[PDB]
Amino acid sequence: NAMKILVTSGGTSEAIDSVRSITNHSTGHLGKIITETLLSAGYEVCLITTKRALKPEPHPNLSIREITNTKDLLIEMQERVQDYQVLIHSMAVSDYTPVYMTGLEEVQASSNLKEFLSDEVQVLFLKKTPIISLVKEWNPTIHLIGFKLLVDVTEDHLVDIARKSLIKNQADLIIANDLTQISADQHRAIFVEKNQLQTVQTKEEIAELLLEKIQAYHS
Amino acid sequence: AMKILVTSGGTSEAIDSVRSITNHSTGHLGKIITETLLSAGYEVCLITTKRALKPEPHPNLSIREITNTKDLLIEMQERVQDYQVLIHSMAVSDYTPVYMTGLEEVQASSNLKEFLSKQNHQAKISSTDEVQVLFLKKTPKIISLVKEWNPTIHLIGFKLLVDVTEDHLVDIARKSLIKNQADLIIANDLTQISADQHRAIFVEKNQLQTVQTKEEIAELLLEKIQAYH
């Protein structure tokens, strides 16, 4: 019976205080197209997404879980990851988490900035969040696909960053893309693997190639 | 005959292509106020935001969605002259991003004010940074300009504090009344809002009134507005 795929899409938020949050914007359009492609291929999909993200139409093999933050996402991954054979992580999540916000004068006065890690101008300190790098621990046979979005970089740098992420997350595939190469009718991406690259030029092509990769991976 | 301008929700200030620092209010109270006015026959223009709860479509409602404080400044400057009442309930960012960098660049600086005159494309930032540091400056004054754009508009604002006495809440609200030439400030304490209560104090120059729920807030504002004409 049906193979089970976990897909994330949309963008998380992280509160700074009672008034402010760091928020991530992604319409989750590509996640929606990918999910639709997988549903049509006969896969069972659990889509972990956010409030306003684009969603596929209801489908008997589709379930949707809305979350808000990194905590929620971490919880889902621990709960579900052992039960799924593929994870495609396309949700925008901040790699840095807000820790402390204070006036510049306090910061200026400090003899040691590492202290802040435990009024004209404000200063916000964020620390590395470190996730997906724990997924292969929890289910070392899950097929792990992630994305890397950079902005106005060389394609060599893009591949290099994607490859580092591939090694770090023990991912099987990183789909790398540059904001400046995505437009209304084009979406250049590089499918980055340990020992090969492939480029595609549109969202439909990303979804179809990903399907091919998933089918080949699972025979 | 009197047209009402309402704001709700919260502004989002972009950090980069994906991330923003956002005042996360979903503007529920703004929604109820707007519904209340529409159902009493007022023409309402609602300035609101992407994440805000929206009233249902209505023949007498116009909605304008905005993103950041700059957008809000432009809408108010353009519209205030055309409305007879402003109910300002949107949570407006006090700060906006200027420069985002790695902790190491900040540590090496001999004067942090240098960072206010820099642009993000100059920044020494990497995924290897254990810590990143964002400098933000004050946003432009807006509400204090309202009574200059339209001296005869009835200005109603809000003031939201956290875990304070009601006398302090009144003190702060009155200071805001004077600073904005506001007519009325609806003051409230985050810790006195729940699923079925919303304590608020209608602060005027020389009198006070109190209410217990969002519906009561809306109903009293309706009464006060009906009293204008």
What are the distances in angstroms from CA A18 to CA A65, A111, B98? Answer: 25, 29, 22
Our CA-based measurement puts residue A91 at a distance from the nearest CA of chain B, in whole angstroms, of: 11
Mutate to test the interface with A, among B12, B16, B19 (most CBs of A within 10 A): B19
Per CATH, the homologous superfamily of domain B1-229 is CoaB-like (3.40.50.10300)
The identity of residue A155, as a single letter, is E
Our CA-based measurement puts residue B64 at a distance from the nearest CA of chain A, in whole angstroms, of: 18
Contact B195, B222 (CB under 8 A): no
Q: What was the experiment behind these coordinates?
A: X-ray
Q: Quick one: tokens of B173?
A: 């609200």
Distance of CA A152 to the CA centre of its chain: 19
Q: Kindly determine whether residue A20 and residue B19, on different chains, have CB atoms separated by under 8 Å.
A: no
Our CA-based measurement puts residue A51 at a distance from the nearest CA of chain B, in whole angstroms, of: 9
In the block, tokens 């202290």 appear at A115
Burial class (CB in 10 A: 0-12, 13-18, 19+), B196: exposed
Q: Quick one: tokens of A179?
A: 């904001």
The identity of residue B191, as a single letter, is T
Mutate to test the interface with A, among B12, B15, B21 (most CBs of A within 10 A): B21
* CA atoms A154, A155, A161, A164: torsion sign: negative
Contact B15, A124 (CB under 8 A): no
CA–CA separation, B78 vs B124, rounded Å? 39
Neighbours of A34 (CB within 10 A): 28
Across A31-120, the runs of DSSP E, i.e. the strands, are 44-49, 62-66, 86-89, 96-103
CA–CA separation, B152 vs B157, rounded Å? 15
Q: Domains of chain B: which residue ranges?
A: 1-229
CA–CA separation, B104 vs B129, rounded Å? 8
Collect all residues of chain A within an 8 Å Cβ-Cβ radius of residue B136. 121-124
CA–CA separation, A31 vs A29, rounded Å? 5
Mutate to test the interface with A, among B53, B131, B163 (most CBs of A within 10 A): B131
The residue in chain A having the minimum alpha-carbon distance to the alpha carbon of residue B92 is A19
Mutate to test the interface with A, among B11, B15, B16, B18 (most CBs of A within 10 A): B18
CA–CA separation, A146 vs A166, rounded Å? 8
Please check whether the domain covering A1-219 is classified as CATH 3.30.1310.10: no
Contact B8, B50 (CB under 8 A): no
Q: Kindly determine whether residue B112 and residue A104, on different chains, have CB atoms separated by under 8 Å.
A: yes
Beta pairing, strands B200-203 & B208-211:
antiparallel
- Contacts within 8 Å (CB) and 24+ apart, B109-114: B111/A108, B112/A104, B112/A107, B112/A108, B112/A123, B113/A104, B113/A121
In the block, tokens 């304590």 appear at B199
Smallest CA-to-CA distance from A205 within A62, A10, A33 is with: A33
Rg of chain B in Å (alpha carbons): 20
Q: Which residues on neighbouring strands pair with residue B134, listed in sequence order?
A: A124, B100
Contacts of residue A106, defined as CB under 8 A and 6 or more positions apart, other chains included, come to none
Burial class (CB in 10 A: 0-12, 13-18, 19+), A185: exposed
Q: Cα A148–A153–A156 angle (5° rounding)?
A: 80
Helix (H) or strand (E) holding B199: none
Helix (H) or strand (E) holding B44: strand B44-49
Q: Quick one: tokens of B195?
A: 């699923």
The identity of residue B154, as a single letter, is H
CA–CA separation, A173 vs A209, rounded Å? 12
The residue in chain A having the minimum alpha-carbon distance to the alpha carbon of residue B9 is A19
In the block, tokens 């090496």 appear at B108
Q: Quick one: tokens of A164?
A: 């580092």
Helices B214-226 and B28-39: angle between axes, nearest 10 degrees: 40
Torsion of CA A115, A116, A119, A120, to 10 degrees: 100
Tell me the HSE value of B60 on the side-chain side, using a 13 A CA sphere.
16
Residue A42 Ramachandran class (φ > 0 left, ψ -120 to 50 alpha, else beta): left
CA–CA separation, B100 vs B228, rounded Å? 48
In this complex, the residue of A21, A92, A121 whose CB is nearest that of residue B18 is: A92
Our CA-based measurement puts residue A67 at a distance from the nearest CA of chain B, in whole angstroms, of: 15
Collect all residues of chain A within an 8 Å Cβ-Cβ radius of residue B106. 113
In the block, tokens 């999910």 appear at A35
In this complex, the residue of A13, A23, A124 whose CB is nearest that of residue B134 is: A124
Q: Quick one: tokens of A134?
A: 């724990």
Q: Considering only CB atoms, which residues of chain A are within 8 Å of chain B?
A: 11, 13, 15-16, 18-26, 51-52, 92, 94-96, 104, 107-108, 113, 117, 120-128, 149, 151, 161, 179
What DSSP letter does each residue of B55-123 carry, written as one string? Answer: PPP-TTEEEEEE-SHHHHHHHHHHHGGG-SEEEE-SB--SEEEEEEEEHHHHHH-S-GGGGGG--GGG-
Helix (H) or strand (E) holding A199: strand A197-200
Length of chain B: 229
Smallest CA-to-CA distance from A48 within A82, A24, A72 is with: A72
Contact A94, A71 (CB under 8 A): no
Q: Quick one: tokens of B97?
A: 């991003």
The identity of residue A69, as a single letter, is N
Contact B35, B223 (CB under 8 A): no
CA–CA separation, A55 vs A66, rounded Å? 11
Burial class (CB in 10 A: 0-12, 13-18, 19+), B90: buried
